[PDB]
Amino acid sequence: AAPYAAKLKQTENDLKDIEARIKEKAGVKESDTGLAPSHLWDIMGDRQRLGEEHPLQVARCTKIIKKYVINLKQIAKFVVGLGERVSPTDIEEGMRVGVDRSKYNIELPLPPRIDPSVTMMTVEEKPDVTYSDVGGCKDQIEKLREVVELPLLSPERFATLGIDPPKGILLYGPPGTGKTLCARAVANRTDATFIRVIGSELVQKYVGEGARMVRELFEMARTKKACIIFFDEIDAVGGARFDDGAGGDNEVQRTMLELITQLDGFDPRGNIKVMFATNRPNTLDPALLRPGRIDRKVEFSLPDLEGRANIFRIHSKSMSVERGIRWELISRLCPNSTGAELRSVCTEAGMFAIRARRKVATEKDFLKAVDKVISGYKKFSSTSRYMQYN
Amino acid sequence: KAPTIIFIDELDAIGTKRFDSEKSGDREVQRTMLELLNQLDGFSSDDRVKVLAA
Amino acid sequence: DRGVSTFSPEGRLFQVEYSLEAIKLGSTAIGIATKEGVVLGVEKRATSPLLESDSIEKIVEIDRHIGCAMSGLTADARSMIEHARTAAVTHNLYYDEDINVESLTQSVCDLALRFGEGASGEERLMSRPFGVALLIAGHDADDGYQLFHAEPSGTFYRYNAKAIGSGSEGAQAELLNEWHSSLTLKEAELLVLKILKQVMEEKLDENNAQLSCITKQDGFKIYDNEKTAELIKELKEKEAAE
Amino acid sequence: TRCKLKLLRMERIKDHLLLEEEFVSNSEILKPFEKKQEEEKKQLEEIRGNPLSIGTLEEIIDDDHAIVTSPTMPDYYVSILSFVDKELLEPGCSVLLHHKTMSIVGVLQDDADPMVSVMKMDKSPTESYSDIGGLESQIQEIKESVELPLTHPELYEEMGIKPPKGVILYGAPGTGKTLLAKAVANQTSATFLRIVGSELIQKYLGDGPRLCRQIFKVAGENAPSIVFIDEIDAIGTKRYDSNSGGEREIQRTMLELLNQLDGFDDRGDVKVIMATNKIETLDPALIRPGRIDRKILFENPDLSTKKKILGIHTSKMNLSEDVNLETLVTTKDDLSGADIQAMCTEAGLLALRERRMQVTAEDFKQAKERVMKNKVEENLEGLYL
Numbered sequence A: 001a002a003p004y005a006a007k008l009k010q011t012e013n014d015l016k017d018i019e020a021r022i023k024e025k026a027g028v029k030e031s032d033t034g035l036a037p038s039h040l041w042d043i044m045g046d047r048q049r050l051g052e053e054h055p056l057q058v059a060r061c062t063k064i065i066k067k068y069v070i071n072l073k074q075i076a077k078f079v080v081g082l083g084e085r086v087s088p089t090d091i092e093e094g095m096r097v098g099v100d101r102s103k104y105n106i107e108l109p110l111p112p113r114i115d116p117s118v119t120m121m122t123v124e125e126k127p128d129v130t131y132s133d134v135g136g137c138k139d140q141i142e143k144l145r146e147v148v149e150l151p152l153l154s155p156e157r158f159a160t161l162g163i164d165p166p167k168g169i170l171l172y173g174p175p176g177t178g179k180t181l182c183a184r185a186v187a188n189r190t191d192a193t194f195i196r197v198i199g200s201e202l203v204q205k206y207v208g209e210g211a212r213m214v215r216e217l218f219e220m221a222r223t224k225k226a227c228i229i230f231f232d233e234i235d236a237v238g239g240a241r242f243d244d245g246a247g248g249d250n251e252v253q254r255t256m257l258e259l260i261t262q263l264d265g266f267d268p269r270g271n272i273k274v275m276f277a278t279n280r281p282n283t284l285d286p287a288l289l290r291p292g293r294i295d296r297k298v299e300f301s302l303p304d305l306e307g308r309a310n311i312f313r314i315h316s317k318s319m320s321v322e323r324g325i326r327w328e329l330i331s332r333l334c335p336n337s338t339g340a341e342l343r344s345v346c347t348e349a350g351m352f353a354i355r356a357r358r359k360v361a362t363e364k365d366f367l368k369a370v371d372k373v374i375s376g377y378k379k380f381s382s383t384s385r386y387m388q389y390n
Numbered sequence B: 001k002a003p004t005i006i007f008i009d010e011l012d013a014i015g016t017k018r019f020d021s022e023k024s025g026d027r028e029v030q031r032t033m034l035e036l037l038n039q040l041d042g043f044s045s046d047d048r049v050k051v052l053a054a
Numbered sequence C: 001d002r003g004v005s006t007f008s009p010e011g012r013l014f015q016v017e018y019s020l021e022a023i024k025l026g027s028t029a030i031g032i033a034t035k036e037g038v039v040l041g042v043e044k045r046a047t048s049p050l051l052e053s054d055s056i057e058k059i060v061e062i063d064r065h066i067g068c069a070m071s072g073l074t075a076d077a078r079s080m081i082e083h084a085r086t087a088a089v090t091h092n093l094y095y096d097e098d099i100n101v102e103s104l105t106q107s108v109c110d111l112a113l114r115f116g117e118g119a120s121g122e123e124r125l126m127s128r129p130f131g132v133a134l135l136i137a138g139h140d141a142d143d144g145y146q147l148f149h150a151e152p153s154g155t156f157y158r159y160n161a162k163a164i165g166s167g168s169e170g171a172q173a174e175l176l177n178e179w180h181s182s183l184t185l186k187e188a189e190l191l192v193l194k195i196l197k198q199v200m201e202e203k204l205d206e207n208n209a210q211l212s213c214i215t216k217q218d219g220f221k222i223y224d225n226e227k228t229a230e231l232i233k234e235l236k237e238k239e240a241a242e
Numbered sequence D: 001t002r003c004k005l006k007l008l009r010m011e012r013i014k015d016h017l018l019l020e021e022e023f024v025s026n027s028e029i030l031k032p033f034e035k036k037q038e039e040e041k042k043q044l045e046e047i048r049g050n051p052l053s054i055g056t057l058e059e060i061i062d063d064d065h066a067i068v069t070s071p072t073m074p075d076y077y078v079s080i081l082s083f084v085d086k087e088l089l090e091p092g093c094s095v096l097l098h099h100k101t102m103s104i105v106g107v108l109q110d111d112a113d114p115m116v117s118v119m120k121m122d123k124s125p126t127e128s129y130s131d132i133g134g135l136e137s138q139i140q141e142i143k144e145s146v147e148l149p150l151t152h153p154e155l156y157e158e159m160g161i162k163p164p165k166g167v168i169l170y171g172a173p174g175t176g177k178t179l180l181a182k183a184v185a186n187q188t189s190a191t192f193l194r195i196v197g198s199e200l201i202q203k204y205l206g207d208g209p210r211l212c213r214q215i216f217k218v219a220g221e222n223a224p225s226i227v228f229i230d231e232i233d234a235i236g237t238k239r240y241d242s243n244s245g246g247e248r249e250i251q252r253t254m255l256e257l258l259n260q261l262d263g264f265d266d267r268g269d270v271k272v273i274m275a276t277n278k279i280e281t282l283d284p285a286l287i288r289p290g291r292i293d294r295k296i297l298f299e300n301p302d303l304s305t306k307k308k309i310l311g312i313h314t315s316k317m318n319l320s321e322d323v324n325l326e327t328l329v330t331t332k333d334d335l336s337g338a339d340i341q342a343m344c345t346e347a348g349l350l351a352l353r354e355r356r357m358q359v360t361a362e363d364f365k366q367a368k369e370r371v372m373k374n375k376v377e378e379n380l381e382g383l384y385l
């Protein structure tokens, strides 16, 4: 033992001695973006960088007095005037403008409100779920195409009838049918700006903090033409009308009332299409599910025994399969199963092909696989309770 | 601009009966309901402001 | 806790909705009534190879021309079988005559109604339940073979054929195609097994199935386990001609 | 013994030589550098001088302007000029302004946070699989969905279809769930994030939803990743008042837990790993299979699995011929694995009190009496109901 004890004392001192000298030397060693084109930029950008073009201390107008009154964002009020050649139409109420750094005078007006920025990170950039991805050829998928896609691609046909085109549509049902799987699909195909919100993103402790948000999001959607504002998971901020008399339901119900007064509006909505993906229409509020704002409402159904024979064609054609797997045969054996569980028979036959050491998933690995996932994921009803009615 | 119409769309934002409350943000909300009732009392030059409320 | 008393502001007694789930859990029970012999067949669902198949009873004799098959918890049913047996024999002391089939259903349905709060001295000897269905089948002079469907609701209808239990949905859709008005006894007996095979968890054998009929001359008669093994064997010949 | 030291000396002849060579060629051997590196460092430094004032980018304009806000306060409408790439400019980012005329002289700023410290882990566990050995096939389902599509891209392209996602660990306590997770993060050597589910409930209200949206943006960046939510049952009782818990705080955590793991977001690779001992309180929108694929079920091991389990813990202890290893296992009649581990920590605690440094047959049969008395004193049934 003793010959090797004297070698455990070196291993301890030595691994840390090395370690400090190597990380300080390596450093970021002077790596700063720009690279090879920024040397030609140095000719152009040195005569402008010295100009006072910048800085313009950004301010914001509080009163046009038929001259102009700005309020700096430091709190100190000044009366300024026109610039080099700006039109007197540019200066509007509550608009930000840049003013000369020294003696204050409007040089260049600037777009409005610096509260938008928590609302530009909610906008996604063309999802990859395509439009044939969704199961069946149901008539319910064409109703999504008759409320959103069709009146914006051709407003010629809804102008001859005379009808106000239906603008809303509600997607509701049991989970696993794709409420978000068909709202991604429709964001790929329509090429209209999609604006996803999380309805449980608004909540904070400081009341009417989600009032600011809801306002500015609603304006940001008003400016771009053809938009779709997809509110997911509005069971929080979309609850029943009640009044506990003692809790903190008072913060919660602020953000809903502000959601109500913009939807209908003094100034109607201007080419905004409305989607709601809810789990339940059962607790949802009586002022949101009241029909001018919902228009036409299509509940997405549990696929029938023909709807699962259709769906089973999307997941078994992409796997490598021997020829002659009747898609009716595995759909029968299965009980009443969503399409999110009918996707998991392919994945459990794919993990059993690897165990059995097969390069092909066959009709034998799918018969076993059914038995395992139907038992397994059926047993134990999550909470196996729920209720909370009486 | 008196007489003029202030139209309040909704009124359940400040119209809580609850202003005897026990640790809630009703102590900030209720402060804009009571500044209402003072700016609704008679002191003339407000005898000519009306109100709709839905 | 919900009352038995309370209403759901839809208009519904919560408890009835929960009872009608318990049917569906229990084992499959098919009945096909024709003009030549009512056939009742059920799936036993033997739960271990140790347990003896034939002790289990889910085809039950009410009298000697009213046979009955039950689905759901077999315990709940122990009380309601006994009540039905007495009443049919009571009538046979009292009018020396076969109890109508329809009438017997009504008396079962009446006990089913009972589950009440049990206010004052009033006798409601249950406080709960009766989560089981019956396929009450019979023959009498007034109407030919009949078949009736009892619920725990206190609600019954006549039916030309009705499935109930786990595979009720599937069995229902095959019945609306296959049922006819020209079926023979021998064709109905083979047809019941074919619809019972699809929704049987296990392979169709007579060690998890029991067949019975009621036919005018015989009365009630449950089949031999030897006969049934032979009708299984003949189904697969006709199917293997196709 | 010798194996270890040959390699440790082999990496201290590499570290020594490389540091002397790489220091000498930055301070003496300059030819591909030399003139061209002395001109580039001289141009960028002179042009922006110093001090440089760090700012925060609220928004970009595409004509080469930005609105930056100092953190002190005074806002500025600055210019994007020279020695800057717009690939890294975007909201939240830290830029360098010139302290007189503020022009964005470049972006290189990322300043670590004590909120991204608590989430990210520095650990490298000192146990690897087969110190969990036993319940053998329960770590051979978590290796089919965590390790195996990273290691062989081949097999999951060959069958096609989408790969599995996630797992839930639930079952009897004393079945090792916590060390099972601490082993699937050490094998793979992927970026293992780790959060207890009880930090998601805080006295602050609506601070829940901001904290777990943060957790998933950090996770998406370092992807491929494994997230441990250890104890997601804990969200079911822990609460400080009735509104910092109650329906209010529990719905905020669900909603959040629902968006991160499957939403419109179109999440990159976060594998999720949850430890738990409550399955009948979870969201029914997660034990929806097809978020979370194969769930793992654990029970108390049987007598031959508990022979493999007691052999991992007893090599640690001093070994004798006297020791009766097989008879501690037999007597226990489906008793968990957290007790087997409380009995070998109890054998060296009796051994130290004596100041006898051998663990023999006597110290293990004494330590089993102390382990069966605490769990049996807490059984106040006495005469069996």
Ligand SMILES: Nc1ncnc2c1ncn2[C@@H]1O[C@H](COP(=O)(O)OP(=O)(O)OP(=O)(O)O)[C@@H](O)[C@H]1O
Binding pocket: A133, A134, A135, A136, A174, A175, A176, A177, A178, A179, A180, A181, A279, A311, A314, A339, A340, A341, A343, D262, D285, D290, D291
């Ligand atoms: N109709 C369908 N056809 C093909 N696949 C489907 C369908 N419905 C669901 N899926 C599959 O199941 C996956 C998960 O379902 P999804 O997450 O869309 O459920 P959800 O409807 O949004 O439920 P919830 O929002 O309450 O959790 C999808 O990514 C998709 O692979």
Ligand SMILES: Nc1ncnc2c1ncn2[C@@H]1O[C@H](COP(=O)(O)OP(=O)(O)OP(=O)(O)O)[C@@H](O)[C@H]1O
Binding pocket: D131, D132, D133, D134, D135, D172, D173, D174, D175, D176, D177, D178, D179, D180, D277, D301, D309, D312, D337, D338, D341
């Ligand atoms: N089946 C097993 N094989 C090998 N070791 C085991 C086994 N079960 C338990 N152990 C040992 O017991 C120790 C204590 O386990 P740990 O604290 O991780 O258990 P747990 O089941 O996670 O407990 P809890 O029920 O409190 O969540 C483990 O760290 C592990 O070494």
Ligand SMILES: [Mg+2]
Binding pocket: A179, A180, A181, A232, A277
């Ligand atoms: Mg959804």
Ligand SMILES: [Mg+2]
Binding pocket: D177, D178, D179, D275
């Ligand atoms: Mg643990």
